[PDB]
Amino acid sequence: MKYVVVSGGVISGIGKGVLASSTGMLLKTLGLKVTSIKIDPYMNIDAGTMSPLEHGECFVLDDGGETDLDLGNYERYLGITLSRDHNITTGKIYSHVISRERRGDYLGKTVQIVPHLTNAIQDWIQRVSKIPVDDTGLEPDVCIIELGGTVGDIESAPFVEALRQFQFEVGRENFALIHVSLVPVIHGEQKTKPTQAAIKDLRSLGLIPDMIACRCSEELNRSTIDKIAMFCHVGPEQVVNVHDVNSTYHVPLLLLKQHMIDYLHSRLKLGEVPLTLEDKERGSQLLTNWENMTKNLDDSDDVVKIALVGKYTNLKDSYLSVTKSLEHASMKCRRQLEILWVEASNLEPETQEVDKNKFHDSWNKLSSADGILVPGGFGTRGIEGMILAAKWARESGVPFLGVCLGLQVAAIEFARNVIGRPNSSSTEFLDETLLAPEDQVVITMRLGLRPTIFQPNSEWSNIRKLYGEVNEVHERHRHRYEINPKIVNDMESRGFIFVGKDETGQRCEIFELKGHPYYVGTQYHPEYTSKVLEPSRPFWGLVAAASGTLGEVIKDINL
């Protein structure tokens, strides 16, 4: 079990996620069974009790664990599934030993943070990194660790001590540390001194960097490479840069041109770790696939505007897996995405009493859209606005995808306008109204992986064709409220077919609407299962409908 620990920096908010994930992807092109751990110095146990106003999406694993946003970046780049234990936090590990303490398992000793926490942190990393994360049951070869926070922090203190001991308990030639660092440029001069003071506080804590990765407003001068390397000892070929470039998917290609694989292959002796010719052939495949899809990102110019309809769209972090999944679809289509960020709070005509500009700006964006998407956040405040976007797409042929709250507002729109019961509602919005047509009932949330089965009369359905005509699908959920099962037989008689259901038949999970080019929704979140090199099928469909060639996409999938 080799380790690469990404770490460091003078500002927490600099460059670790993009680098760690890119390191993991690069090491995956060696054919190594790479795995990945996040260390979050924050106290939260798991993400379900924290709102999207901080650290973005409430991301979900096959385990059903609401987890840190940064796990999603490892899944979507590495092509792996992570267990809820691959996110380590301050309150997780303190809750762990305090649970073990009240259980009596410390045999009456005084429990001291050294060695006790620094043993729990090491034992957790050594448990977790052996867990299988691939399509096959084999244990991993190399673990990337993102140390969140900065080295030299009250809260990352037990984690840096635990890593200091771990660097000896699993030796040199089996552990390597990469430190991300700021290199400010002021008056056009690349001032190294913050990445010298931050290496005093690094070496004080006994960790030793084998690579320095810079974030800077420029490429590094040969002078500032030497000025880092002579003070903060690494070779001249072990300082690397992650400068501003318009594509995050090119950061693996920068680091490979800076020879980072050739250094880590030497520094972790990776040629001695056993691999087959098939592993090495999958390794060169992962590289050449990533080069070809980035060549498509380079030479593509034919824009496709997707309108993404929701709340808090000024905090663009709130829809990160949506945004990345749309880009995975757009790259597979060889077409340049733009996302129009559309405020559902503005589409409502009530906006026109308060500010006309917001109304017409939102409808300008929606009118411009080659496809529409209601991806669903949390809370009720924008539901009328999303019904307007569900209407516009139905009455105007515009492609549509309703994820989670998107199913519920698309069925509420269909009930309000095509069944024609003007009172029909989301029970989470309007429980006090006690309707017959409640388009929502509570069934405290169905979370993580579940099997979805298609209803037999569906060989005509494009959405099941995008899933390859298979009988069953496995995807990740978040829903407390669901479609009302009594209303289904009415909606299907109007052509709003619920193409996918739970095996019990009481819970309805996919629709596709007859005669419309492409109008779909999913009760599961298809964002979370997207991979960069193999995109999520409802999102590939939406961008393919917005692009044209949806038939050719389906034909190619059917081969």
Ligand X SMILES: Nc1ccn([C@@H]2O[C@H](COP(=O)(O)OP(=O)(O)OP(=O)(O)O)[C@@H](O)[C@H]2O)c(=O)n1
Euclidean distance between CA atoms 198 and 196, whole angstroms = 5
Min dist CB 223 to ligand X, Å, is 8
Four-CA torsion 325, 329, 330, 334, nearest 10 degrees:
150
The interface mask with a copy of itself, positions 75-104, x = CB under 8 A, is ---------------xx--xx-xx--xx-x
* 215 makes contact with a copy of itself (CB under 8 A): yes
Euclidean distance between CA atoms 344 and 507, whole angstroms = 27
Of positions 75, 146, 161, 370, contacts a copy of itself by CB under 8 A: 161
DSSP 139: P
* 265 makes contact with ligand X (CB under 6 A): no
* 444 makes contact with a copy of itself (CB under 8 A): no
Q: Which is nearer to a copy of itself, 193 or 381 (CB)?
A: 193
Min dist CB 70 to ligand X, Å, is 6
Q: Which is nearer to ligand X, 114 or 436 (CB)?
A: 114
Q: Which positions from 183 through 202 interact with a copy of itself, judged by CB under 8 A?
A: 184, 186-187, 189, 191, 193-194, 197-198, 200-201
Is 527 noted as a catalytic residue in this protein? Answer: yes
Is 525 noted as a catalytic residue in this protein? Answer: yes
**Residue 515 interacting entry, from a copy of itself, ligand X, none, C-beta within 5 to 8 Å by type:** none
Q: Which positions from 229 through 258 interact with a copy of itself, judged by CB under 8 A?
A: 230, 233
- DSSP calls for 310-364: ES-TTSGGGGHHHHHHHHHHHHHTT--EEEEEEEHHHHSGGGGGT-HHHHHHHHH
Q: Say if strands 34-40 and 87-89 run parallel, antiparallel, or are unpaired.
A: parallel
- DSSP calls for 170-199: S-TTSEEEEEEEE--EETTEE--THHHHHH
**Residue 470 interacting entry, from ligand X, a copy of itself, none, C-beta within 5 to 8 Å by type:** none
Q: Which segments of 415-469 does DSSP mark as H helices, in order?
A: 427-430, 462-466
Q: Which positions from 196 through 235 interact with ligand X, judged by CB under 6 A?
A: 227
Q: Cβ distance 450 to 475 under 8 Å?
A: yes
Question: Where would I find the beta strands (DSSP E) of 67-174?
Answer: 87-89, 142-147
Of positions 49, 102, 104, 154, contacts ligand X by CB under 6 A: 154
Active-site option among 404, 475, 482, 512: 404
Residues 6+ positions from 338 with CB-CB distance below 8 Å: 303, 304, 305, 306
Euclidean distance between CA atoms 24 and 34, whole angstroms = 6
Euclidean distance between CA atoms 130 and 117, whole angstroms = 20
Q: Which residues bind ligand X (CB under 6 A)?
A: 11-18, 21, 41-42, 73, 77, 112-114, 148-150, 153-156, 161, 180, 191-193, 227, 248, 317, 320
Q: Which residues bind a copy of itself (CB under 8 A)?
A: 10-14, 41-45, 49-51, 53-55, 90-91, 94-95, 97-98, 101-102, 104, 106-114, 116-117, 150, 152, 154-155, 157-158, 161, 165, 168, 182, 184, 186-187, 189, 191, 193-194, 197-198, 200-201, 203-206, 215, 230, 233
Give the active site residues: 404, 525, 527
